Amino acid sequence: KIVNIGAVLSTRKHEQMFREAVNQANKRIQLQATSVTHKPNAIQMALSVCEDLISSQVYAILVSHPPTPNDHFTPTPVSYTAGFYRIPVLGLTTRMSIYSDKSIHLSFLRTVPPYSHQSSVWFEMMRVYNWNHIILLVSDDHEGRAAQKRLETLLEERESNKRGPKAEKVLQFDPGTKNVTALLMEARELEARVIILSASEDDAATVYRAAAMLDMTGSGYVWLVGEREISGNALRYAPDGIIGLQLINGKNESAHISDAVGVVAQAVHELLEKENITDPPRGCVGNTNIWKTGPLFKRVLMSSKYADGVTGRVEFNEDGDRKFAQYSIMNLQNRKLVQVGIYNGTHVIPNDRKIIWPGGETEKPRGYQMSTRLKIVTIHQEPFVYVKPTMSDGTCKEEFTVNGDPVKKVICTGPNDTVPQCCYGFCIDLLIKLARTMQFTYEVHLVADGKFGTQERVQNSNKKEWNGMMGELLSGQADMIVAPLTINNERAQYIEFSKPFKYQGLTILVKKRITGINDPRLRNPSDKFIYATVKQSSVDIYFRRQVELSTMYRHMEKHNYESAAEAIQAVRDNKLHAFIWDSAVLEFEASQKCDLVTTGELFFRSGFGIGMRKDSPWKQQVSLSILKSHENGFMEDLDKTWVRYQEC
């Protein structure tokens, strides 16, 4: 009818006052406490648990008895043994979720809640900051990686108005490295100033050090770091205007361990408040199995809550680790902490004085900033872009129009089979309409693939994804590129593309029957009838979705030409019946050279395109921009500029 609990404390006062409050709340059907020290050897704490707790039939122990040299205090295998009896255990020794995970440690709690909600409190706290674009990286590790995971769960929480919990970029680092200078270059590649990371204080010293070297730690980058990164020796390397945080009243075993006594009492009377309330067997040796009621007692721990404790009102968590904590924010004042205050679940405490941003920034700056030059890549589209070899100095030959206007070819760089060049085409003219709307420069590259990209499963990994520069747009390699291509569900599957005002067409061109594809002459092409399209083309997907594609796609896969330019070759060569290509582009080619007679059929008529990946100002800018494009004569211009360029 009395509680018997062995334990292991950090200091004598921990054990004595432990038994003291144990008496006090034991009155608040009686209970007492017994504790040990932190046993130096691993086996010392081990058999120590096998006796002082076990032989005591120990109720529970809230255990932090570190040197406070971090270390994620060893007694994980201890609470394990508590599982060997299914006896209760609650971690006092860690602010990491390492002490959380049940598959590792089932019975456990946190007087220092897992750092998960911490940076999440920095997430909703960024909603307070009202920041949007935010990028993140950290060193390779389970707690770190999965920490970023849970952060994404916070981001994933917003899944179900204007903008939102914008995730800028997710990077990662390895554990224990010196130079992030590559990832620093990624931060350069990061437009957003929001810097989300977590580490220890010394790796954080690498962060502010090499970051300042990259001028990342320089003013103009909003650094949200981890407490372990923030607190500690990093104070020497502390970034200017940076802030750091920790939960309210966490590090003091006085109020925190006192709270362990109080909630321990809520679970004592509560421990006496359930059916078949008792204590587990004592002897470790002599216990070969887990206590069934001891496990049921842990269910009571899942049922364990407290009205108000020594730290005040606190409940359990999903992990049962504390609850409703408050992380005290401290702004920098002359490289010294000026406390903003504690952000509870609902509550958040700003400072009295204005907090210091990393620089002299009064408010959170605007992170996302697009580049003036937006790199582009494509293959010459005879419909618009004709890329000629430039001058010996790379200059382009000044070329008047039929009207006489000295049209401007599009300077470019392209591969060896690397070389710069220029391109005469109406596409870059539409680009001049683009920068003409909102100024955007660009860097032109080439595209050697079978399309923009072709969703494709490679010879390895069987990974089906766009094969071509389209992945590089998914990769954003070229910042903003374009191709006069029709969109596909694959693009839909890939990313939102633009809507070109151009109206394209898709059919096969023949040299100059010849009915539609379904026509038996075409549907059953004879030996004399050979036809194909470019390998890995978009039409390759088109026919690649069809009932009869066996003959067409399959049988033509033999006849399939890799290069569409090569299809023009064998086409004018008339080495085959007809050539499947873009019927629009066919009209462009039939325009310049009528030696091929294109069909008159109508299939897959969409239009041109430009590089569009997820959120871009080109969303509405480019959308309504096109609305003007067709809405203005620039459309009719291209007609004149291109369609009217057809003599025959």
Next chain:
Amino acid sequence: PPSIGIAVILVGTSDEVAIKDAHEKDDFHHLSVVPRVELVAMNETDPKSIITRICDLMSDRKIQGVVFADDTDQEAIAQILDFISAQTLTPILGIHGGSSMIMADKDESSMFFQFGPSIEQQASVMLNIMEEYDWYIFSIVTTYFPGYQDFVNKIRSTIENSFVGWELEEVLLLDMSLDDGDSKIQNQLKKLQSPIILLYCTKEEATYIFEVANSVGLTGYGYTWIVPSLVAGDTDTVPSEFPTGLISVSYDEWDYGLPARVRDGIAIITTAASDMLSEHSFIPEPKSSCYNTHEKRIYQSNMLNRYLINVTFEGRDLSFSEDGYQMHPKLVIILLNKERKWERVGKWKDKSLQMKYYVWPRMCDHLSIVTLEEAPFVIVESVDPLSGTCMRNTVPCQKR
């Protein structure tokens, strides 16, 4: 040729005599040392006794290490397999029971070894079974219990980049601790149009929502049941609250013997050990006792354990994973029989499987048909050689 000081644990009911025979009945020619025999003995299941006779055993005796195993249910088998492994800096590979069980997310420096697939890789072979099940669309289930984001993770992952005709409806993850606000058993229950039912949860909770599903009856004949071996637990255990005729896979209880494959495993310890005997040509400084090993911790830096982490023995691959999972994992397909007990489904190993029978796991509508190909009326078809899938409606036929 150096004799490897070792201890092979025996606890509970176990016959280690034949183990002593075979371990003394073989000689390893390729390895530096020929095959050897050292066998630990234990009785009590108290982990305190595990530290006693074990931490006293390998340390007190002459050993550079030991391989401990038993058939018990111990999770602390893993908890102190890694905890005591790295705590001793000693590799721990469970050869049976709660020992051979795959540790979930061990410690960084944890020396405890392992063999098998990933639960990820497990459910992946299960996806291969779905190809055998030939269900293009699918769906799954999970609890909030662990492996949740993992099973869904590698699940949608395998369902992601592939060129396979894999498709799935969804998976309902939840927590049955409190009540169900929506009684979502029905809500997600009707949401399931796929016959295959694949859930992730504990066998007891599996009985909670499984029996709750019998109440829903959504298990009604024509569905299909994919179960985790962990969710399954004991083959001898056959809770009726779970779905009848459920399917699973795991390490072979029938085909794979503990003493035999365990002995071969010791021979693998010889394989990687001799590999390091050549390559490393040295070893870290061993200190037997805990306080002794307390000072010798820093003296342990193993890239040969890494070299050991990549290994093969007796033609089998001894290379473990970051989970310790066997680089070439082998497993036995499992099922729940008409016995109201489990059924042996087959054996699946490393992108290969031995199915129960040519016909699907026929239940107890479906009607057999057979004919000859006369085209255009009837055409035989060659399924995708790399895969076996096809476009359109093409279906297979019988070949003796």
Next chain:
Amino acid sequence: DALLSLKTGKLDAFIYDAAVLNYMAGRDEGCKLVTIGSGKVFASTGYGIAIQKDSGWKRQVDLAILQLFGDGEMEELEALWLTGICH
């Protein structure tokens, strides 16, 4: 075997099902082989895939036929599989 035979004419003619003569009819490398006559009915009959004797699907499968004729996709595949090269 007998098809390429008749192609060479290894026998005077190749007898076969008017269906065999149908799939054989449309598809031909060159134009040589022709039907018995133009293809006039020889032993008018029709084929289907039955089931177990007095199967319950009897009236049901009958309705399935009612969907066959009541389909017109019979014309569809009547091209798809059954469109001939001869035409």
